[PDB]
Every structure is written in structure tokens, then in C-alpha cells.
């Protein structure tokens, strides 16, 4: 490792606000947070959604002329979701979150078959 520069944004002065956010979440809906930042400073705030399947998710990024960032993502499945958040490249003391994505109450889902068939014509 190496340093020497000072640092210059802090990111434990930074804010994270938001439903997406929450200890607690619902799947199929789209949640959407924002990055409230006070002293903070200068710096660019990134957002990485991780699934307890394995993969990551695209999480969508617009900053504002407030010094905050808007994120929004959706929840395929359930389960134990990790987002990484970071200020000027500094890893928040609320990283990782530690986010629940629940069904919400009991449900009773309906599926169906649907026949189909190819077209053209027969000339026989």
C-alpha cells in the first residue's frame, strides 16, 4: 500500500436515506434511494445491488445539483440482497446494507396452460 495526499471527501459525513435502503424491502417493486450529503464534500457516489443468487444487478445513478445521488433498483427474488455504497471512493461505515427483500403477505398465485399453434399454409 501507499499514501500521501490527504484525503479531502469524507464519506462517514454522508447520508443514506431511502426505501431501497430500508432494513427491509418488497420484491417486483422498484424501490428508490438518495445519498443526502451535508459536509461531506466533493465526490462521486457509486451503487452496486448484489442478489443472494450470486450475481449483481444494475442499480441506476443520477446525481443532482444538491450533492445527492438518486438510485433506484428492483427485486426479482427474495432473499439476503448486499449493496455497496461509496463517497469519493470511500467505503460508507453503513457498507455494506444489509437488505431483506420479502413477498409481503400470503398470496395465492394462478397459472394457466396457453395452446399455440404455427401458421402457414398447406398446399397438400
Same mark, same amino acid.
Given at each position: 500500500?501507499?499514501?500521501?495526499?490527504?484525503?479531502?471527501?469524507? !464519506?462517514?459525513?454522508? @447520508?443514506?436515506?431511502?426505501? $431501497? *435502503? =430500508?432494513?427491509?424491502?418488497?420484491?417486483?417493486? #422498484?424501490?428508490? %434511494?438518495?445519498? +443526502? =450529503?451535508?459536509?461531506? $464534500?466533493?465526490?462521486?457516489?457509486?451503487?452496486?445491488? @448484489?442478489?443472494? +443468487?450470486?450475481? #449483481? /444487478?444494475? !442499480?441506476?445513478? *443520477? #446525481?443532482?445539483? +444538491?450533492?445527492?445521488?438518486?438510485? %433506484?433498483?428492483? /427485486? !426479482?427474488?427474495?432473499?439476503?440482497?448486499? *449493496?455497496?455504497?461509496?463517497?469519493? $471512493?470511500? +467505503?460508507?461505515?453503513?457498507?455494506? %446494507?444489509?437488505?431483506?427483500?420479502?413477498?409481503?403477505?400470503?398470496? /395465492?398465485?394462478? #397459472?394457466?396452460?396457453?395452446? =399455440?399453434?404455427? &401458421?402457414?399454409? &398447406?398446399?397438400?
Amino acid at each position: 500500500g501507499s499514501s500521501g495526499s490527504s484525503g479531502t471527501g469524507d !464519506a462517514s459525513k454522508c @447520508l443514506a436515506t431511502g426505501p $431501497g *435502503i =430500508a432494513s427491509t424491502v418488497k420484491t417486483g417493486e #422498484e424501490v428508490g %434511494f438518495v445519498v +443526502d =450529503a451535508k459536509t461531506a $464534500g466533493k465526490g462521486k457516489v457509486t451503487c452496486t445491488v @448484489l442478489t443472494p +443468487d450470486g450475481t #449483481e /444487478a444494475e !442499480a441506476d445513478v *443520477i #446525481e443532482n445539483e +444538491d450533492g445527492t445521488y438518486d438510485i %433506484f433498483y428492483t /427485486a !426479482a427474488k427474495p432473499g439476503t440482497y448486499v *449493496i455497496y455504497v461509496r463517497f469519493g $471512493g470511500v +467505503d460508507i461505515p453503513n457498507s455494506p %446494507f444489509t437488505v431483506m427483500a420479502t413477498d409481503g403477505e400470503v398470496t /395465492a398465485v394462478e #397459472e394457466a396452460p396457453v395452446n =399455440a399453434c404455427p &401458421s402457414g399454409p &398447406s398446399s397438400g
